[PDB]
């Protein structure tokens, strides 16, 4: 219930440079394109020489890139994840199911995600607008949430145990045998939104 912990450590764990959301923002609505992302392109967008746009990400130590050395994942992947996010005519993958909910409002899209039951492998799908979710199938979702490290590489230590679940009485006894997580909760689909409506306000206050 109490959600300060979780925006505290993961804006903590994402911010670890002075203009790591500057860059993240245009960053997420390029990939949203569906293409991989050159430097060049965010040093244009963001009018920053390509070695800054290179330290910020070097401290992204879980940023995928493909043969070319282009940018093709940073929470929003072109590669393959348990959790799809589609925009428009554009297949695209989140690394979690709370990046789902966070990067509609982000890049200003409406996205319709899907993914699978973490406990069950039922499929469960749902609408996130920036402001709001719709279409929850089915309805009574479920995400799970960890307390992010601030250290670690963030996909290992959040991404990885936060997932969809078809229900809270599913997730919780799936929650049951996963001790030793700190900070592990079950949430309802719409608590997590919020969440991420918290986490996302925090981080767009730090834009220049
Ligand atoms: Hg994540």
């Known amino acids: 219930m109490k959600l300060a912990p979780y925006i505290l450590e993961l804006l903590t764990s994402v911010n670890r440079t002075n203009g790591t959301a500057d860059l993240l923002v245009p960053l997420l609505r390029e ?5 991989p992302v050159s430097r060049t392109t965010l040093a244009g967008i963001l009018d920053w020489p390509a070695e800054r746009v290179a330290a910020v990400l070097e401290q992204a130590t879980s ?6 050395g282009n940018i093709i994942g940073y ?10 996010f589609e925009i428009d005519d554009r297949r695209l993958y989140a690394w979690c199911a709370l990046d789902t909910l966070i ?3 982000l890049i200003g899209r409406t996205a319709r995600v899907s993914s699978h039951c973490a406990a069950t492998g039922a499929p469960v799908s749902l609408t996130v607008s920036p402001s709001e979710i719709q279409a929850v199938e089915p309805a009574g979702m479920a995400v799970s949430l960890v307390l992010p490290q601030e250290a670690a590489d963030v996909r290992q230590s959040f991404c990885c145990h936060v997932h969809f679940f078809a ?4 997730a919780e006894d799936w929650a049951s045998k996963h001790q030793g997580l700190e900070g592990l909760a079950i949430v309802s689909v719409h608590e997590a939104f919020g969440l991420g409506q918290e986490f996302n306000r925090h981080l767009l206050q730090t834009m220049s």
């Open 167 to 170: 229900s809270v009485p599913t």
């Open 75 to 84: 929470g929003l992947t072109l590669r393959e994840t348990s959790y799809v």
């Open 103 to 105: 990067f509609p409002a």
């Open 63 to 68: 940023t995928e890139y493909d043969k070319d």
């Open 31 to 35: 990939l949203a394109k569906g293409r």
